[PDB]
Amino acid sequence: MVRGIRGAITVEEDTPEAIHQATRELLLKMLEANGIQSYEELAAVIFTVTEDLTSAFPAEAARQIGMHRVPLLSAREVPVPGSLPRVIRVLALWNTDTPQDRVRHVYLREAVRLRPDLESA
Amino acid sequence: MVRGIRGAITVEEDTPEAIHQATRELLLKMLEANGIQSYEELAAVIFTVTEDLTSAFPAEAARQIGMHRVPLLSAREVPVPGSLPRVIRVLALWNTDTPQDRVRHVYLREAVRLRPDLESA
Amino acid sequence: MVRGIRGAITVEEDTPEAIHQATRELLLKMLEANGIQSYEELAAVIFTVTEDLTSAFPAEAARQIGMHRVPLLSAREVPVPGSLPRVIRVLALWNTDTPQDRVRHVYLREAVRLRPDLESA
Numbered sequence: 001m002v003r004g005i006r007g008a009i010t011v012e013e014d015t016p017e018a019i020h021q022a023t024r025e026l027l028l029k030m031l032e033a034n035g036i037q038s039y040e041e042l043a044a045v046i047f048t049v050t051e052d053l054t055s056a057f058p059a060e061a062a063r064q065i066g067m068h069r070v071p072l073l074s075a076r077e078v079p080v081p082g083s084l085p086r087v088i089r090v091l092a093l094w095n096t097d098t099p100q101d102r103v104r105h106v107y108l109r110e111a112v113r114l115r116p117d118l119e120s121a
Numbered sequence: 122m123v124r125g126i127r128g129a130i131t132v133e134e135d136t137p138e139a140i141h142q143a144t145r146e147l148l149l150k151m152l153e154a155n156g157i158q159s160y161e162e163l164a165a166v167i168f169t170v171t172e173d174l175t176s177a178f179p180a181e182a183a184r185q186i187g188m189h190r191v192p193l194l195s196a197r198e199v200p201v202p203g204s205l206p207r208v209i210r211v212l213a214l215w216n217t218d219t220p221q222d223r224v225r226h227v228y229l230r231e232a233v234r235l236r237p238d239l240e241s242a
Numbered sequence: 243m244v245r246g247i248r249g250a251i252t253v254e255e256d257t258p259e260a261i262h263q264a265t266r267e268l269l270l271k272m273l274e275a276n277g278i279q280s281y282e283e284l285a286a287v288i289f290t291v292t293e294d295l296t297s298a299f300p301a302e303a304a305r306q307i308g309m310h311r312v313p314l315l316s317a318r319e320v321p322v323p324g325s326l327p328r329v330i331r332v333l334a335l336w337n338t339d340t341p342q343d344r345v346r347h348v349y350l351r352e353a354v355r356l357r358p359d360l361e362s363a
């Protein structure tokens with residue numbers, strides 16, 4: 001049994017340096033938030049990028065933090081009018097028996113605006 | 122162990138009202154067809170939309186039926202010439218030991234044309 | 243518990259005959275490399291294609307080798323400048339307890355250039 005973990009983060013520019021940094025930061029925070037101890041717990045990680053980000057592969061950033069042995073895939077997000085620009089989204093598939101309500105999803109920088117429900121009191 | 126569940130549905134127009142309704146209908150029918158009792162059985166749900174649908178996020182529709190705690194991701198489908206227009210596709214990842222041939226895939230409206238094998242006698 | 247299996251292959255032209263052949267070849271090699279004995283071991287398979295490939299659905303090729311009962315989904319890859327053209331990527335989600343370092347990822351034709359780490363001595 002598997003639990004997905006969602007993440008999202010924004011960048012201010014379509015450059016590799018920006019995209020790679022943001023992706024590394026988000027991945028590490030997703031793992032930390034969930035108490036993951038090894039990349040071996042990850043079945044796979046899927047990324048999406050908005051259409052305004054073409055300069056870099058998020059999987060390259062994941063390999064900068066050593067995710068060579070984690071299977072990675074990336075795709076393009078739907079360009080909805082008025083939706084948040086320059087977003088990197090992550091779906092990590094985690095081999096765990098953690099209950100669904102104990103999985104922690106991580107939305108950073110302006111991406112917090114995507115999920116106001118995940119703000120809490 | 123995990124089983125994917127596929128769904129697909131068409132809409133007649135690229136509007137949020139159409140996309141959201143179709144997505145809600147399809148998701149509920151996928152769950153019902155498979156005898157799912159809780160959203161907690163879902164590892165994650167991945168959506169795709171054809172390039173002729175940009176007005177809405179399918180994940181927003183999933184949140185209208187309460188999928189806040191289900192990890193969701195969306196992407197764009199390949200624009201193959203002559204392929205069916207205005208299709209919302211769903212891949213639900215289901216934590217189950219159901220055999221592969223007992224999983225029920227759900228193709229609604231004109232999307233039945235995608236999978237004539239799933240028509241039966 | 244699930245392990246992803248990555249594959250990738252290139253084609254020389256955007257035609258169905260080329261895309262379908264390459265997809266069939268890659269899928270079978272991914273299964274063989276990992277000692278998979280039944281399609282029932284596959285939770286789902288996700289494909290991506292680069293933006294320069296629109297003539298065919300990789301899932302149609304998977305159905306030419308009988309993957310009707312395997313849930314399939316396809317999406318478009320990020321068009322990064324200078325990245326390899328005409329690539330079909332595969333993420334197979336495999337129900338297995340195989341350790342992460344014993345899963346075999348398969349990169350064929352020019353797609354070997356994507357992952358020089360997977361060349362070995």
Ligand SMILES: [Cl-]
Nearest residue numbers: 103104105118
């Ligand atoms: Cl959370």
Ligand SMILES: [Cl-]
Nearest residue numbers: 224225226239
């Ligand atoms: Cl079925």
Ligand SMILES: [Cl-]
Nearest residue numbers: 345346347360
């Ligand atoms: Cl390998």
